[PDB]
Every structure is written in structure tokens, then in C-alpha cells.
Amino acid sequence: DLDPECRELLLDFANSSAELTGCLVRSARPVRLCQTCYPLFQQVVSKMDNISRSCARSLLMADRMQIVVILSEFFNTTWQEANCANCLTNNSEELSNSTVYFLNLFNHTLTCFEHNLQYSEVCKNCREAYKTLSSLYSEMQKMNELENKAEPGTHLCIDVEDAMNITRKLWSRTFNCSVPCSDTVPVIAVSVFILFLPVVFYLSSFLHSEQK
Amino acid sequence: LPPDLPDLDPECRELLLDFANSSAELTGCLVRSARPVRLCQTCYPLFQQVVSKMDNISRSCARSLLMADRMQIVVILSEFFNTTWQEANCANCLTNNSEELSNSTVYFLNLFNHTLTCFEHNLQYSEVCKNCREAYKTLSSLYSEMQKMNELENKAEPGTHLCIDVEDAMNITRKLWSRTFNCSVPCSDTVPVIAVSVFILFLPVVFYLSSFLHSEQK
Amino acid sequence: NHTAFRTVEIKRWVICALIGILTGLVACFIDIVVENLAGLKYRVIKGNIDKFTEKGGLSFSLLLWATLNAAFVLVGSVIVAFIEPVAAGSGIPQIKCFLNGVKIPHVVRLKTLVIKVSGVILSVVGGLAVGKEGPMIHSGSVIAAGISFRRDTEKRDFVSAGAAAGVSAAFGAPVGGVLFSLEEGASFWNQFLTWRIFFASMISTFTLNFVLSIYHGNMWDLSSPGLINFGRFDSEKMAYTIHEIPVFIAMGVVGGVLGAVFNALNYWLTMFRIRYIHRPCLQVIEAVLVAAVTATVAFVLIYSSRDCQPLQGGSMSYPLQLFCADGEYNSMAAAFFNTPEKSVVSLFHDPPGSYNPLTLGLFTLVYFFLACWTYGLTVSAGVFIPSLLIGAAWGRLFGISLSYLTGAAIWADPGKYALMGAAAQLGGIVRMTLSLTVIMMEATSNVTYGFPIMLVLMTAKIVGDVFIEGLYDMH
Amino acid sequence: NHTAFRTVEIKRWVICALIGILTGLVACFIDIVVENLAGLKYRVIKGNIDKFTEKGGLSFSLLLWATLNAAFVLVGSVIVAFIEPVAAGSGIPQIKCFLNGVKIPHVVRLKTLVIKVSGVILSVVGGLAVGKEGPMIHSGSVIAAGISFRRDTEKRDFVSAGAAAGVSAAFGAPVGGVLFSLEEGASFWNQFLTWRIFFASMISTFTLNFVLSIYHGNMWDLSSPGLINFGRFDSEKMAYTIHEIPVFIAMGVVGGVLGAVFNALNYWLTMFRIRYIHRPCLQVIEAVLVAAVTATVAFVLIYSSRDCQPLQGGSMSYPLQLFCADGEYNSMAAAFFNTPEKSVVSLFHDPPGSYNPLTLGLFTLVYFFLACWTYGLTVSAGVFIPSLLIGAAWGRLFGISLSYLTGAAIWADPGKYALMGAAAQLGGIVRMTLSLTVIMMEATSNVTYGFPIMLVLMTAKIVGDVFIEGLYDMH
Ligand SMILES: CC(C)CCC[C@@H](C)[C@H]1CC[C@H]2[C@@H]3CC=C4C[C@@H](OC(=O)CCC(=O)O)CC[C@]4(C)[C@H]3CC[C@]12C
Ligand SMILES: CC(C)CCC[C@@H](C)[C@H]1CC[C@H]2[C@@H]3CC=C4C[C@@H](OC(=O)CCC(=O)O)CC[C@]4(C)[C@H]3CC[C@]12C
Ligand SMILES: CC(C)CCC[C@@H](C)[C@H]1CC[C@H]2[C@@H]3CC=C4C[C@@H](OC(=O)CCC(=O)O)CC[C@]4(C)[C@H]3CC[C@]12C
Ligand SMILES: CC(C)CCC[C@@H](C)[C@H]1CC[C@H]2[C@@H]3CC=C4C[C@@H](OC(=O)CCC(=O)O)CC[C@]4(C)[C@H]3CC[C@]12C
Ligand SMILES: CC(C)CCC[C@@H](C)[C@H]1CC[C@H]2[C@@H]3CC=C4C[C@@H](OC(=O)CCC(=O)O)CC[C@]4(C)[C@H]3CC[C@]12C
Ligand SMILES: CC(C)CCC[C@@H](C)[C@H]1CC[C@H]2[C@@H]3CC=C4C[C@@H](OC(=O)CCC(=O)O)CC[C@]4(C)[C@H]3CC[C@]12C
Ligand SMILES: [Cl-]
Ligand SMILES: [Cl-]
Ligand SMILES: [Cl-]
Ligand SMILES: [Cl-]
Ligand SMILES: [Cl-]
Ligand SMILES: [Cl-]
């Protein structure tokens, strides 16, 4: 066994990882990872660093199944894939202003839908509320790429992505509100005219060569 | 809104909360059993509770909890717990019924305790290896036999590990026996080895010289 | 004496080192310019489509797409038809004739290289169903014949090195390039000549890999040995059994039959163009009309496509959302907006169920006839990449059908059959098997896949030759 | 007369298919029997060593090891020295002579194949510092000349197909086998002949891969294209840039210098053997003594090695624990107990902190002279694998020094330099460069590494030829 002062770092890391894992689950269906228990992840990585700073040898690589190592790697991997750094400020102490602005806009957009539920009313009452939310989300996408120099625009903070996907699924799948202007007749007329050009060109050249 | 997208369905809220505290208990028990490794003998009830809870939640809440979003927290957490169980390899040294440790593992742990408690009262390290040598020998024979049982009853791969708590038990004993106690068996076979090796290495010298000398004349 | 021989020999290696370096640089120039110009063109088209999607007036987006395609091909066809007609096509038959021994006028002039590189850039940016890898073989030959020893015997040897360097740069197959120079040469074995051909071939693919790496900033990563990179086939999914060998032979029959039909339609089309579209003005008009029709057919398929799925990490370079839910992008648009090399790679490496058979089937049928119609145009363009895309498209459909018929069996990986389909279409069309076979292994980096590939190519060639005779007899 | 030509040609393809099938089967027979016999021998030796480790009497374990090595080689040398002297060596010079045009007696007789296959099995099981891949070329040629067209020109073409099938089976490089047949032939290009050579080579590597999979139980992973499989080289650690190119050139000089010393030592040794050890009885005694010495030199290194580290998972088959803590195997024992092909693979792919420089350095120094001494023995054995093992051993040491001298830089990966060092030794020893390089790209399945491999191989040949001229002049 380890020293009694060396069993306190492991026990503190034990309950810190226990409560972080609890929040990860109970904040999963409506994804609220980076806004509910961002400090709990910070508390875990701080407590792990405390061990790294006279117990690292006897707790970290002391055996084949490095439970402390793999659990911290798993928590780090979950934090990285969830892009929770993008959700918080560069100081990583609270939610960024852009994320906070999106969250209340998401609340306001959902506040529309309840009022207009009692689907024709929803689509024609505050459609601009959905439009401004989508404009911000696209704006935050390009800002994210230009901020961390990410090559594509793919993955934002999972809280923001889930918030928008809930809105998009509500606006398109549950409600039928998307109304794109489809000019089928002008499209057919132009496409047919262009597709009929090679017929004229091949026939005219064939007939011109005949009779010289 | 429908009670699906913005908020959890009461049927699925309670199931997710039940999986939440089950996963919290397993993670807490995983860390506190990391050193010394008592993982697969103490966390087996908690791991079975987690996998049962996940199965209960997945076949009226499977589609709204598992793949309802990109970051499938429930899926990845269960995959991590499953991966830890497989790499720790406690499937082999847990019984087929899987309510308690197998007879082999129970027989190893009590001998490991007996070997360790024999070391404790032999300090007050010459006396430790002078007296408590047969106890280490039978424990090491069991572990070597345990590997062969794993290579035959399970038949996975040569060099496959047993459950980590058993392997850590032997590594603690081996490190105690050879590193701290410094109990090494001297060898007096160096002189016969050199004599035989020198004789064999000297054979090609004779063979090449004799061939050259024989062919020097006729 | 030895002093004179060694002085000449080192200059041969020095020249063949420059041939490989310059061939790789030209491939870098073609790849960089095409990527930047096509990206600018597609951003304009995508931006215009998005503006008109909800406000109305999508017919103007179709007109802009057709005009942009026509404008680029207008320049790309005027220079080929009016200045240097020899630059038309991939230029391989001209290079094969040069290595054979017959000199076609204006094949190895510096003007031809400028027009061939400019023509292939404008033709690819012009939206034609073509590939830029084919003309790279002609470009290497012209570099070799100009950099170079002012005699016929040495010049042919250098041109062989240049053609080999072009094949190596185009596909990342230095050994395949050496094989290509060997069979087209068909001369006595020269150890030193084959050595400097290999030296030029491997220098060429390294220069392309190195310069593109610094262009991407990822100097510590060399993952672009050629213009088209198939990817890595080191997957348990990409594993075959002996029971699939008869299935692969069946794909070769399909590739041979489709390749024969591809050549049959192109043969009759070529006879029409020779008789009636021989005037340079008509060739330019025909190339412009094909480019306009290619954009129109692509737009019609995109407009009528009702299947769209959410954006992946790199599924689309320019994701086009049209008439479906927010956060989802048209799948058919990704087929046409993405570069044909990117489409081939995605078909090779994609999880099962990624492609809807209807949109993939419609794209395959349309692209098959567009590629057949596009070949023979008085533009500098190849046919290997369209042949690869056609084969991968229906090969993936074959894999999709097998998974449905065998209950989603593990061995019925659509990506694996996409590779087999791509080889079958290439085999049934180009009828060049040895150098092609080595190219696939070097592209796939999998020796074990050579055997099904070799069988598929061999089946396609013999089936294609028999079917071509039968079709001509019926006519 | 097209009907007569077709019947003749299909029979040629049928024969060339059997040549590939039988060549692969012989490779399977050699691989299966060797691993079973060597497994039985090492289990006996390991069991005997573990019995005498604590109770004393390890000198008896040394005697048992030497006797077991001598007994196998005694049978393997008697059948070669007394029955078929032509089967001695790898048979590469005999095959090159036959393909040249000059026929050596008894090269392509059926008895030679039996002696060659039996001799290579016994010599490898006999513990000699040799490899079984080299003789596989000779085995394929004899199969081709027996299955087969009873005229000299057809025999040469068929033998070249067998030799090509041997290279493909030995190394999993079907294209390398085709190249090897082309240069050793050095005749007019033949499209159909090069096709049958390519067909036979490609069947041979598939038959070996397929049958070994059946033996290994699992079938859905054809992971053994050849007798020696390098592995996968797709790692971020395993990458390079321009800055490492001059380093690779320097390592090619080392391989050429060491290869020249390897040849110079073997040349003087061969001169002694011809003058004094030309009798068949003395040849058998010499081979037995080398086998006894090889076991003895291996034992003293294993006995005196203080470096043992715990079992890190696989990487061996017979973990020998000697004089150190339980649960830890002797590091030097794994160097000799493991097959040379397995040792090469571990050197290529391993974490940068897996080899002790002293343990690896001592093994490299001893194995270099053991391999040089074992080459001229009157046994059926090759030198390709020992040269690969020597090069990978000091190549890894070069990578270890680079990590120390550059502060564990990420570009100084020892595994990458092990591969480059393996090429340098192999290129500087055999001086065959055009066929060898194609094998390496096929073996590593990475075209990006072809360029450094090319420069390393070319550098080794140039300095090797210069050094042997200087060394001979000094003598
Ligand atoms: C982004 C780039 C790669 C797009 C390509 C557009 C231009 C850079 C290309 C297209 C047409 C090319 C021209 C085609 C033909 C000529 C004529 C040629 O002059 C002659 O010696 C021949 C004159 C004749 O016989 O008509 C010199 C090169 C030049 C100007 C070429 C220069 C490069 C041009 C302008
Ligand atoms: C005159 C010859 C030489 C060419 C004839 C071409 C026709 C066979 C093509 C050209 C344009 C095509 C049309 C282009 C667009 C549409 C709209 C499409 O309707 C939708 O799906 C609208 C909703 C949506 O956008 O999803 C149905 C197919 C249709 C009529 C197509 C049917 C086939 C058409 C008429
Ligand atoms: C067909 C779809 C699914 C793919 C898109 C490709 C078409 C727009 C292309 C491919 C081949 C082309 C055809 C190739 C040859 C001809 C023959 C040509 O001349 C004749 O029909 C008369 C010849 C004579 O009288 O000898 C008229 C144009 C046409 C039909 C072309 C029209 C445009 C076609 C159908
Ligand atoms: C585990 C080991 C010790 C088993 C032994 C395997 C080989 C050493 C044996 C098995 C089959 C034997 C072969 C069986 C038949 C013959 C034919 C025989 O030819 C003759 O009858 C003529 C001999 C002559 O006069 O030269 C020569 C020996 C040879 C090749 C034998 C050589 C020794 C072989 C290869
Ligand atoms: C007569 C010619 C042709 C051959 C000469 C051979 C010697 C140079 C070799 C053969 C055996 C070797 C010895 C083998 C073993 C050892 C034991 C070693 O020390 C130990 O006792 C370590 C072993 C352990 O306890 O693990 C020191 C080197 C030494 C004397 C070696 C020194 C070098 C020796 C004498
Ligand atoms: C560093 C060593 C321990 C690695 C293992 C290899 C040696 C055991 C081998 C390699 C080369 C062999 C030598 C090759 C040639 C000779 C020369 C030979 O003597 C002569 O030829 C004498 C000629 C004369 O007297 O003119 C005696 C055997 C010997 C030393 C051999 C003895 C065994 C050697 C040293
Ligand atoms: Cl052409
Ligand atoms: Cl082409
Ligand atoms: Cl192309
Ligand atoms: Cl020989
Ligand atoms: Cl060998
Ligand atoms: Cl050899």
C-alpha cells in the first residue's frame, strides 16, 4: 500500500472523477456539457496535476493498467471532441459572451414556439427569430475558424451545435416552415433550351456539310 | 414543444439519472482500486450494475438517449467502461456465472496474502529468503500454471494477461522478492561454461590450421 | 575512353534529374492553379445559388454556371484548336507514336507544353468531365525533349524518361511509370537507360510530394505522392476471401462490356466529328456547348435531387444547401462540386450506407455519357480520371447491391468493390494492362489486392476485345 | 495458323500458372516445416536451460544447443556436399548464369529441388546465420524447368518465370520478381513473355498468402504476402524531410563500406576454402563446426548479458529468463532465439526506447562476422535475410545515436533508420540495385520512402565498388 499522505491524492481524484462522470451523463440528452460542469473538468485536471507535481511514481505508471492515466485521457478526449474550449473564454473560467448570447437567443427562439403552438402560426410569427439565430450560428462558425485557425468549419462547442440542431429539427422536421422559392418553370425552360443547343449544332453542321 | 427535443421525457429522464449515478459509482470505485490493483475483484458488482443499466436503457428510450446527438456520452462512456474491462481481462478470472471470484483467483489471493504476511514478520533481509522461500516458490508455480490454464481453457494468445489484480499481486511479490529484499540465487557455473565455450571456439582454429598444415606438403 | 563515357553518362543523369524535377514542378503548378481557380469558380456559383435559393431566380444561377463553364472552355479550346491542334486530348497516342519511332509534327515543342498545361487547367476549371492526370504524361515528354545530346537516339531515351516521370507524378507510381516507358519502348534491355528512367520517375514523384507539402504547410507530412492519391487500404473491411474471386471476374466482364460501349459510342462520335466538325471554329463551338450542357445536366440533377444528408467532416468542399432542411446539404451537388479525384477517394473509403443508390446511379449514368461525349473534344484533357470515377461509381453500386443481397455481410464492403469497379472500367477502356496493374498496387499500397486487380483487368481486356468485334460485326 | 498459336499460348499460361502455384506451395512447405522444427528445437533448448538455471549445470545446456545445431547442419551439409554440390548457396549465381545462357550441370534437375528445399530447412533449423528467402529463387527455377516446350528458348523463358515467382514468394514483391527476371534476362522486350512472368509471380505470392492463412486458422486477413513481411510504415513518427536526405546518404556510405568489408572478408575466406577445404568431407566438418560455434557464441553473449527487461507483450516465442528477476526475460536471448525475419520486423517497428545499444551493438558485431563466415559453407542457404538483419541492427543503432545527439528529436525515429540501414547493408552487399529497390517499396508499401531508399541503395553501390577496388589494391 501507499503512504497515508499518498492515499489522499488518489481519494481526492477518485471523488472528483466520480462527480465529473455523474455530470457527463445527466447532461447528455439535452447536451449541456461545457456550460454545466466546465469547472468539474477543471477540478479534475487540477487534481490530476497535483499528483503530477511526491506521488506521481506510485500512482501514475506504477502498474500496467494505468487507471488514473487512462481515465484522465478519456476525460481529456471527451473535452476535446466536445470542443468545450470554444464554449468558454480563453481564460477558461466562464462562458464566452458569444456563447452566452447564443444561449439566450436559443431560449428566445424556443419562447416563440410555445406561444405560437396554440403549425401555420409558428412559421409566420417570428421567423426572423429563427433567421437571426441561424445567422449568429453561421457567424460563430466562421469566427471559430478564423480564431483557432481551423482549416474547415466543422465542429463548434457541443452545447451550441445541439442547441441549433434542436432548433433546426423543430423548424424543419416537426414544423413545416421552410419555404424555398422554386422556379421550376424558368429552370425547365432554360435547361431545355441549353440542352437543345447541341441537337441544333450537330444537325446544322451535318446539313451544312451536305450540299457543301 | 414535444417533450423530446428541448427537454427530457420523464420516462427517459429517470433512466438517464439511474445510469448517471451507476456510472459515477463505477468511476469512483475504479480510481480508489487503482493502487494496489483490486480492480476486477471489487468493481465487478459496479460494472455489472452499469452494463445492466445500459441494457435496460437500450431495449422506450433507446433512440432519444443513445444516438440522439453527435456526442453520444452514454455510448462512449459505456464503450470506455467495456474497454477497461476487456484490457483489465477480468472476464477470464471471473467465473462463468459472474457473481464472485473464481476458485483459482480466490486460491491465488489468499496465498498472496499468506506470502506477504510471511514476509512482514521475517524482517525484525537475509532471513526472509532463508525461510520464506518455499512460500514464494509455490505462489510463483501457481501463477505460471495459471497462465497455462488461460492458454488452454480460454485459448486467446501466448503471452495473454490474466486479470490485472492477479498480475499486480505477482508483480508486487516479484518486486519485493528481487528488488527490495535483494534475494538472488548465486551461480557457480561460470568456470565450466568458460571451459566448454573456449574448447568449442578453439575447434575451428584447429580445423583451419590443420587443413592448411596438411595441404602444405602433399 | 572511360573519361569520355563517364562525362557523357553523368550529364545524362543530370539531365534526367532535371526532367524529374521539372515534371514534378509542372504537376505542382497544374494542381495548385486548378485548385485555386476551381475553388474561386465554385465559391461564385455556390454564393449565387444560395442568394437565389430563397429570393427566387435560380434560372440565373444555371445561366451563370453554364456561362462560367463556357467561358473557361472557350479559352481552353481556342488555344488548342487554333494555335496547336496537337495539344488536343491526353497526348498519349502522340507520345506512344514518338516512342514507337514516328515523329508527329509539333509534339515536343515548347509551345505545345505551354498550351497543354494551360489547356488542361482551363478544361478542368471549365467543368468538363475530364481529368488532369492524363495530359501530365505529354507534359513530361515535352520537358524532356526541350531540356535535353542533340541527336535522335538520345532524345528518344530522354522522352521515355519524361513520359515515365509524367506517369509517376500523375499517379504516384514511379515503378508504373518505368513500366510504361518500357513497353512503349519495346527495345533491347538497357540497364543504364532503365536506371535513369527510374531515377527520373522517383525524382518526379518526390518533387510533387515535397513542393505540395510546403504549399500546405505540413512539411512534416508527405501524403501526396501523385496528383491522385487513393488513400490507405489497411482495413479489415478492405479484406477479401477466395470466394469473392469469381465475383471480381464478373466485375471485369461488366467493366469490359461498359468499356466496349464507351469506346463504341466514342468511335461513332469521332467519325461524326472528323467528317463534320473538322473546321477549327466548329471544334471551339462544340467544346463550348459540351461545357454548357455539362453544367446544365449537373444543375438539373441537383435541382431535382430530393436526397440530402448532414455535413460530415470533409464530405463537401463547397456544401450546397438547396430546397431541404437547414444543416443538411445536397448529396448530388457534392458529386458535381467536388473534384473527380476527391469523389473517387470518398467512394473508395466510406462507411457502408453513405451513398444513396438512386443519386449514385443517376450520377453514374449521366457521367458515363458526359465523359464519352467529352472525349474527342479539341481540348487538352485526359480520360483516366473519368474512367476511374465511372468505375468507382458503379463498383460502389455493385457493393451496395451485394450487401443488400447477402444481408449486409462483412465481406460485401462497397468500398472494396468500388476499387474493383474502378479497375474494371479503366481496364475495359484504356486496354493497357501491365503498366496499369503496377499503378493500382502503388496507388493502393497493398500487394495482396494486386491479384484480384490483375484478374479484373485481364477479364476486362479480353471481354472488351471480343465485345468490340461483336458490336462492329452487328453494325 | 492462329488456332495453333492460341493452343500453344494457353498452354504457356497454364504452365506459368502451375509454376506460380507450385512455387507458392513450396514456400508454404518451407515456412511451415521450418517454424515447426525450429519451434521444437527451441522448446527443447529453453526447457533444458530453465532446468539447469537454478540447480546448476548450464554447460550441459550449451552442449545440447551445440549438438542440436550440429546434428541438423550435419544432415543438411552431407546431402549438399556429397550428393548435389550445385545446391550449395542461395543458387542466385547459378540462376543468373542459366538465364545468361551458359548452363551449369544439375542446376534444374528434380533432385536439386529436393536437396535445396531439404537443405534450406535443415540449415535454418540448424541455427546457422542464414536466411531461407534466398534459396527460394532457385527452388522456383527448378520447378519451372521440370513442370514445363522442350527446347532451350522456352526453358529460359519458363525458368525466368520460376525465378520471378521465387522472388515474389520470398519477399511479397511480385513486381520486383518481374524486374529481377528482366535484367537477368537482358534480352529483347517481349510483351507476352513479360505477361506470363508477371502472371506467375503474382499467382505465387497469392498462393503463399492464401495457404499460410489456412494454416494459421484465420482466413479473412491475407497478412503474409511473402516469407518476410516488413509490416506497415504509416506513422507520423515514421516520416522524413529534405534535412534527413544527407543523413541517409551518409548511412548509405556506411552500408557500402560495411558491405565491402563483408565481401572482402568473404573473398579471402572463399579463397582459403577452395584451396584447402575443397574435399566433401572437410566441407561437412566445416559446416558442423560453424553451427557449433554459432550456438556457443550465442550462448556466451546470452550468459554474460546483464540486460533483461520484463515481458512487454509478444515480440518473442521462447522467453528465456537467465540469472535475473522473475517475470523478466533476457534481452540478448530474444535476439538469437527469435527468427531473423521476426527480429527484423521488431527492429523496424518498436518504440524508441526498446533496445539497449550495448546489447544490440554486441549482437550486431557478432552476427556480422557469423553471417560472413557462414556464407561460403557447403549448405543450401541465402544471405539476403542476414544482410537485412545486420543493416537493421546497426541502422537502429544509428537512430539511437541520433536521438541522443538531437535531444530525442521527433525526426530521429530509430525504426525509420532501421529500415534505411537495412537497405544500406543489403545494397552494399549484393550490389543488385534496380530489382532490390522495387522490392523495398513493395515490402514497405510506401512510395514516399522509395526516394530515400533509392539514394541509400545507389550510394551503397557506388562506395562499395570504389572501396573493394581500393581494398584489393592495398592487399
Ligand atoms: C491561370 C492560368 C494558368 C490560365 C491560363 C491563361 C493564360 C495564362 C494563357 C491562356 C492562353 C495562353 C497563350 C496561348 C498562346 C500564346 C501565343 C504564343 O506566341 C507565339 O509564339 C505563337 C504565336 C502564334 O503563332 O499565334 C506565346 C504564348 C501565348 C501568349 C500563351 C500565354 C499564356 C496564355 C495567355
Ligand atoms: C429537348 C431535349 C434535347 C432535351 C430534353 C430534356 C428533358 C428530358 C429534361 C430537361 C429539364 C428536365 C426537368 C428539370 C427539372 C425538373 C423539376 C423536377 O421537379 C422537382 O423535383 C421540383 C422540386 C425539387 O426541386 O425537388 C422534376 C423533373 C423535371 C421536370 C425535369 C424533367 C426532365 C427535363 C424536362
Ligand atoms: C443521354 C444522357 C443520359 C446523358 C447526357 C449526354 C447527352 C446530352 C449527349 C451524349 C451523346 C450525345 C449525342 C451524340 C451524337 C448525336 C448524333 C447527332 O446526329 C444525328 O442524330 C444525325 C446523324 C445522321 O443523320 O447521320 C445529333 C446529336 C447527338 C444525338 C448527340 C446529342 C447529345 C448527346 C445525346
Ligand atoms: C528431420 C530430418 C533429419 C528428416 C530427413 C529429411 C531429408 C534429410 C531427407 C528426406 C528425403 C530424402 C531424400 C529421398 C531420396 C533421395 C534420392 C537419392 O537418389 C538416389 O537414389 C541416387 C543417389 C546417388 O547415387 O547420388 C538421393 C538422396 C535423396 C535426395 C534423399 C536425401 C535426404 C532427404 C531429402
Ligand atoms: C581461444 C579462442 C579461440 C576463444 C576465446 C574466447 C574468449 C574470448 C571468451 C569465451 C568465453 C568468454 C567468457 C564467458 C563468460 C564470462 C563471464 C562474465 O562474467 C560473469 O560471470 C557474468 C555471468 C553472470 O553471472 O550472469 C565475464 C566475461 C566472461 C569471463 C567471458 C570472457 C570472454 C571469454 C573467455
Ligand atoms: C568477433 C567474433 C568472435 C565473431 C564470431 C566469428 C569468428 C568466430 C570467426 C569469423 C572469421 C573466422 C576466422 C576466418 C579465418 C581464419 C584464419 C585461419 O588461419 C589461417 O588461414 C592461417 C593462414 C596462414 O597461417 O598463412 C584460422 C581460423 C580463422 C582465424 C577463423 C576463426 C573463426 C573466425 C574468427
Ligand atoms: Cl490524343
Ligand atoms: Cl488519359
Ligand atoms: Cl486523366
Ligand atoms: Cl550459389
Ligand atoms: Cl535469404
Ligand atoms: Cl541470398
Author numbering:
A (entry chain D): 79 to 131, 141 to 205, 217 to 310
B (entry chain B): 73 to 131, 141 to 205, 217 to 310
C (entry chain C), D (entry chain A): 115 to 262, 279 to 605
The authors write:
Lysosomes process cellular waste and coordinate responses to metabolic challenge. Central to lysosomal homeostasis are phosphoinositide lipids, key signaling molecules which establish organelle identity, regulate membrane dynamics and are tightly linked to the pathophysiology and therapy of lysosomal storage disorders, neurodegeneration, and cancer. Phosphatidylinositol 3,5- bisphosphate (PI(3,5)P2) interacts with multiple lysosomal membrane proteins and plays a critical role in regulating lysosomal pH by directly inhibiting the chloride/proton antiporter ClC-7, though the molecular mechanism of this inhibition remains unclear.
Here, using a combination of functional, structural, and computational analysis, we demonstrate that PI(3,5)P2 binding dramatically remodels the structure of ClC-7 by inducing close association between cytosolic and transmembrane domains. Conversely, ClC-7 activation is correlated with dissociation and increased disorder of the cytoplasmic domain along with novel transmembrane domain conformations, revealing a mechanistic link between specific lysosomal lipids, transporter regulation, and the enigmatic basis of the ClC-7 slow gate.
